[PDB]
Structure 1
Amino acid sequence: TRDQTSYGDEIDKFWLTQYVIHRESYDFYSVQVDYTAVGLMSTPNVAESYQSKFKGRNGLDKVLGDSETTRVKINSVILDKPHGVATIRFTTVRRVRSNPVDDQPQRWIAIMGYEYKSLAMNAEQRYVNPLGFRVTSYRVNPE
């Protein structure tokens, strides 16, 4: 909509958490929806390193299928609105359909830079991102 670094605590918090759930979760049924969302909510450079694991024969969706899944769980969010910086602590629970039960959960820390860029958008894009939220920097490290 409008060039803007921040939209408030609650607004930024929703877009940030949604992003992590889209990009760190893997469900064979929603992969296309998750894939499309991360692209629109990211700069080309940020979207490039994520789309890489999906290209070619050994693309994640081509290899995994529905043999496994990873669930995502948000645990806390720290906003630095004036700088467009945000820290996110979350948990991920993987599974494989051939094992008895789930495997041990994994704690992560996400350091994200975000903004709201005003640019042209098509109909199918108005559904994904209204305020034009975009991640300009992303990297996760173990807890």
Structure 2
Amino acid sequence: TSYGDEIDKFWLTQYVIHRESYDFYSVQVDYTAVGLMSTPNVAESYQSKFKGRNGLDKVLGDSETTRVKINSVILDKPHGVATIRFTTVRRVRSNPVDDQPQRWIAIMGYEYKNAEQRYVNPLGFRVTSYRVNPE
């Protein structure tokens, strides 16, 4: 539907933070929220990295982490697309210092449309398209 720019930027940036970060303790909720907030087509594309004994949570486990910081969020409400530019920083538990930051661009399409969704996606936020690219 339509809820306002700042409401859009919250779910959009909260989505990027859920999907582009890695912390073993939070992968459960981070993984779940990405589902409700994604179309099944875009959802399975994300779930591909967690299947089998080679899944990210299985292979990486707790050895490292990756944090996200949002730097800008532009909107296009009539069309339902947004361009988010964020930065990630990786670090393994044994790492001496954090890895050099990496800059990214997220081209996203969103829309609005269960008791578990209460503390995750009450407004029915859903991402229909997603594409991350470097800078």
The whole-number CA distance in structure 2 between the counterparts of 1:116 and 1:74 is 22
Q: 1 or 2 for the larger relative contact order (CA 8 Å, sep ≥6)?
A: 1
The whole-number CA distance in structure 2 between the counterparts of 1:35 and 1:6 is 26
Runs of 4+ with deviation above 3 angstroms: none
How high is the TM-score relative to the length of structure 2? Answer: 0.97
Contact between 1:54 and 1:60, CA under 8 Å: does it hold in 2? yes
Deviation per CA, 1:83-140: give whole Å up to 9, x if none: 10100000000001122111100000000000001xxxx2112221111000000000
Q: How far has the Cα of 1:6 moved from its partner? A: 3.0
How high is the TM-score relative to the length of structure 1? Answer: 0.92
Contact between 1:113 and 1:135, CA under 8 Å: does it hold in 2? yes
Choose which of 29, 32, 39 in structure 2 pairs with 1:33.
29
In structure 1, the partner of 2:4 is: 8
Which sections of structure 1, spanning at least 5 residues, go unmatched? none
In structure 2, the partner of 1:56 is: 52
Q: How far has the Cα of 1:55 moved from its partner? A: 0.5
Q: How far has the Cα of 1:74 moved from its partner? A: 0.2
Deviation per CA, 1:3-30: give whole Å up to 9, x if none: xx43211100100000000000000110
Which sections of structure 2, spanning at least 5 residues, go unmatched? none
Aligned positions, number: 135
SS at match of 1:82: coil
The whole-number CA distance in structure 1 between the counterparts of 2:23 and 2:118 is 23
SS at match of 1:46: helix
Contact between 1:6 and 1:84, CA under 8 Å: does it hold in 2? no
Contact between 1:6 and 1:82, CA under 8 Å: does it hold in 2? no
The whole-number CA distance in structure 1 between the counterparts of 2:131 and 2:103 is 14
Contact between 1:92 and 1:107, CA under 8 Å: does it hold in 2? yes
